[PDB]
Design a protein around this ligand. Sequence first.
Ligand SMILES: O=P(O)(O)OC[C@H]1C[C@H](OP(=O)(O)OP(=O)(O)O)[C@@H](O)[C@H]1O
Ligand SMILES: O=P(O)(O)OC[C@H]1C[C@H](OP(=O)(O)OP(=O)(O)O)[C@@H](O)[C@H]1O
Lengths: 268, 269
Amino acid sequence: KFRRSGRLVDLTNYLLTHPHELIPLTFFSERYESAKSSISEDLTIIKQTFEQQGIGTLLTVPGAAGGVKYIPKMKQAEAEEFVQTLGQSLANPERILPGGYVYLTDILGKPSVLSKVGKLFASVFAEREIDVVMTVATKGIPLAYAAASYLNVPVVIVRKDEGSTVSINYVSGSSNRIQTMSLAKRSMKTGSNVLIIDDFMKAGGTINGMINLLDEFNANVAGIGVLVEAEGVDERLVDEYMSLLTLSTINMKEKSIEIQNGNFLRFF
Amino acid sequence: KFRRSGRLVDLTNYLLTHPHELIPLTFFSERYESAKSSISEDLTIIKQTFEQQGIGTLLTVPGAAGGVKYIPKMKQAEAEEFVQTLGQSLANPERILPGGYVYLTDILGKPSVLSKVGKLFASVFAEREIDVVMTVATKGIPLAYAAASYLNVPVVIVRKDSTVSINYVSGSSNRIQTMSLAKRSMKTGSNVLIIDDFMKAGGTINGMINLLDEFNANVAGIGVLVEAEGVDERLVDEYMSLLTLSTINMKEKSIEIQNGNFLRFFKDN
Ligand SMILES: O=P(O)(O)OC[C@H]1C[C@H](OP(=O)(O)OP(=O)(O)O)[C@@H](O)[C@H]1O
Ligand SMILES: O=P(O)(O)OC[C@H]1C[C@H](OP(=O)(O)OP(=O)(O)O)[C@@H](O)[C@H]1O
């Protein structure tokens, strides 16, 4: 039958494991063998706690098609504190790599770090219509998956090497050599709304390549998120995008590195 | 502060997002401004609900400096059901391609699937000592992360391109490849859960195991989503598989999928 206590625990779990899914009140009412109106009072308690604790919000549709949807959201204050902490650990001279690159590998491997970044991306882009999260192998993948797990959409990975395939030449900052990115035609429907995620935007050719690839699929750019941007990305290369951090100054020989907030506050 | 109701909700959230961490009772007492004995009653309700709903195990560690640890677990019944359903999705004729053969890419990218497989892997290897999850680029990276997030460990991604390199041969290829890992990317002595999406002939996983030897690392376990039939002498190291793939077109427009060996990992010797 479920006591009120067990009901709150189970509902909390159920909502948290089914983010961005509209769940009919009748599903819970049958699950708990309780009246829908009692479920709604339970949802009011979870909503309040979710909001007070910075977990997210519950959106409800009343009436005959009645249902509830859990939206992961991050409060501005948590976002700023988290990005600040991340930037401070990035501001380490030992992470400087040749070519104005920054060592992110340890950071991109940690579960706690990834889930906060994923959540921040899902929070900012929560209201966009997004069908799919896309990135290019290899380093962006963890970020793209983390974001996708909160938005509850597929992650699509563009390859650097099946079935029929769409291909796009592009240049990345790591070599003036022309590279090719490709995605199988079945990997994505025409007209998909696509969130592009990546770890580091240096000169913007990679994200621009992904934008050109979507153009071939007749898919739409719903949004763009990167963990770190270098200063001075050509605006023609990349449209609107959100960055968490800015690599504002780097110098291998001086072994000097400076990092600032990205533009993420514009999105709050 | 918190009414008790909000406390049950927040606590549930906190445990779920902090799997495989010992959380001292004092942490919760201070967080909710409530007595430890009141928190213990809440945790008893969560523990009982977590078990009945197949969410996992809430472990109590007794003592003045004790607390609780939430362990994600999946019941055998759900694992069996999940693997059957997944196997049936895999058998869809529309996944047959000329050449390579079976399109698995959407499955490897779907969060509902990834969350389930990750939890299954985490539940089976829950009691092993695991410092890190390891995989090779590219398609199975999300899977590695899903498993790692329930186990609460970092993921290390081996690259196909000081750095440690070893040669090996791939089942979906006909040439010697190289896999590599920076020494600064993984600690020596680590206990390692290797995760792989599709094991053909076993060269990749054996490459990984060889790599681990250069770091004096231990193979704590191996999980693969799908294995091809015909691992004769297989590979030196036991692994768990969910599904087995064979005859990729007989009669016409058909694919043969069977359950893997995962059930061995749910029973006692
Ligand atoms: O000048 P740009 O086009 O901005 O190039 C920046 C690179 C860096 C990043 O590394 P990954 O490709 O994620 O990782 P790896 O190259 O190691 O696979 C990739 O996504 C490109 O965006
Ligand atoms: O077991 P083997 O005999 O080595 O052959 C199977 C290979 C193929 C597969 O490559 P992926 O990394 O999944 O392919 P991609 O790089 O396209 O993701 C990987 O899982 C290896 O197990």
